């Protein structure tokens, strides 16, 4: 799948999930390299540090 699954995910409470895309990368100059990389885009919930610092 083009994204990671959240079918059995329990929410964090201090970090918010935004996007979890995955991509398959190849190196044109190597030809023996391959990997799958997932970007975890996470958004902080700022109330705690707002209250405690700002």
């Amino acid at each position: 799948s083009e994204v990671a699954s959240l079918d059995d995910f329990t929410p964090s409470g201090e970090w918010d999930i935004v996007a979890l895309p995955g991509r398959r990368n190849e190196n044109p100059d190597d030809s023996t390299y391959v990997d799958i990389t997932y970007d975890f885009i996470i958004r902080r919930k700022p109330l705690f540090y707002t209250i405690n610092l700002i």
Epitope: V3, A4, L6, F9, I17, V18
Partner: antibody
Framework: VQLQQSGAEVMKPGASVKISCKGT????????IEWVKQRPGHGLERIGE????????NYNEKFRGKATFTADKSSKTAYMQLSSLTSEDSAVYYC????????????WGQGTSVTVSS | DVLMTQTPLSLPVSLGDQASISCRSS???????????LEWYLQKPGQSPKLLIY???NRFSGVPDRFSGSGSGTDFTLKISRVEAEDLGVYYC?????????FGGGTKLEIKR
């Protein structure tokens, strides 16, 4: 992939609505569902979005309190709840699939028509 | 919320004429990663909106090549080179950069004769 919305609805002012968008053919839990309102006059207005995988939800300024989103993990469907209804809410509501900062709104629902009158 | 403004509210242009739609934002909508997330949609009457362009420099798959976008942090423009009857509808801006994401005001397109 297919996004399936509920059928049209007619109800009196002051009632509450619960329209649903059901998606199939992709990882439902990992996409933001964007709810868009289109008054018959003109203009597309975005009510908010929900991420079925978690409870995350965002509402536009004009719709806070007016609308409320909910999702079911087991059944690939998400619900929008409308608070005390009025004649101004008479419009057609859309559901779309969105992944922020990457490919965007490539699939939409058919559209649900909600009309309010006595 | 970021406010997106589209002009002109109408653009009657005969077939084969270049059509340009302007889009302006209350704030800059450039993102930290180096990209700016602006999307263009087309809603024909009686149909749901259709995606046309995203990350304006880019373009969606399946749409014809006559479409193209460009712009800086606050000013963006969509361009249609050679119009037809299948390009009739309402074009909307959509900024995906700053939460909450908001739509443009829309701009009806007509053909002048």
């Amino acid at each position: 992939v297919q996004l399936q919305q509920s059928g049209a609805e007619v109800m009196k002012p002051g009632a509450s609505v619960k329209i649903s968008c059901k998606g199939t053919g992709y990882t439902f839990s990992s996409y933001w569902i964007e709810w868009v309102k289109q008054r018959p006059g003109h203009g597309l207005e975005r009510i908010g979005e929900i991420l079925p995988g978690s409870g995350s939800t965002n509402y536009n300024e004009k719709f806070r309190g007016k609308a409320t989103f909910t999702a079911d993990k087991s059944s690939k469907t998400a619900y929008m709840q409308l608070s005390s209804l009025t004649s101004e809410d008479s419009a057609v509501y859309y559901c779309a699939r969105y992944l922020p900062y990457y490919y965007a709104m490539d699939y939409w629902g058919q559209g649900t028509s909600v009309t309010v009158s006595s | 919320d970021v406010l997106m403004t589209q002009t002109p509210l109408s653009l009657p242009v005969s077939l084969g004429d270049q059509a340009s739609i302007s889009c302006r934002s209350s704030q800059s909508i450039v993102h930290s990663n180096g990209n700016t997330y602006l999307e263009w949609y087309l809603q024909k009457p009686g149909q749901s909106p259709k995606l046309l362009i995203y990350k304006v420099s880019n373009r969606f798959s399946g749409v014809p090549d006559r479409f193209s976008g460009s712009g800086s942090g606050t000013d963006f423009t969509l361009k249609i080179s050679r119009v037809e009857a299948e390009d009739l509808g309402v074009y909307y801006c959509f900024q995906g950069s700053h939460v909450p994401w908001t739509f443009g005001g829309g701009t009806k397109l007509e053909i002048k004769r």
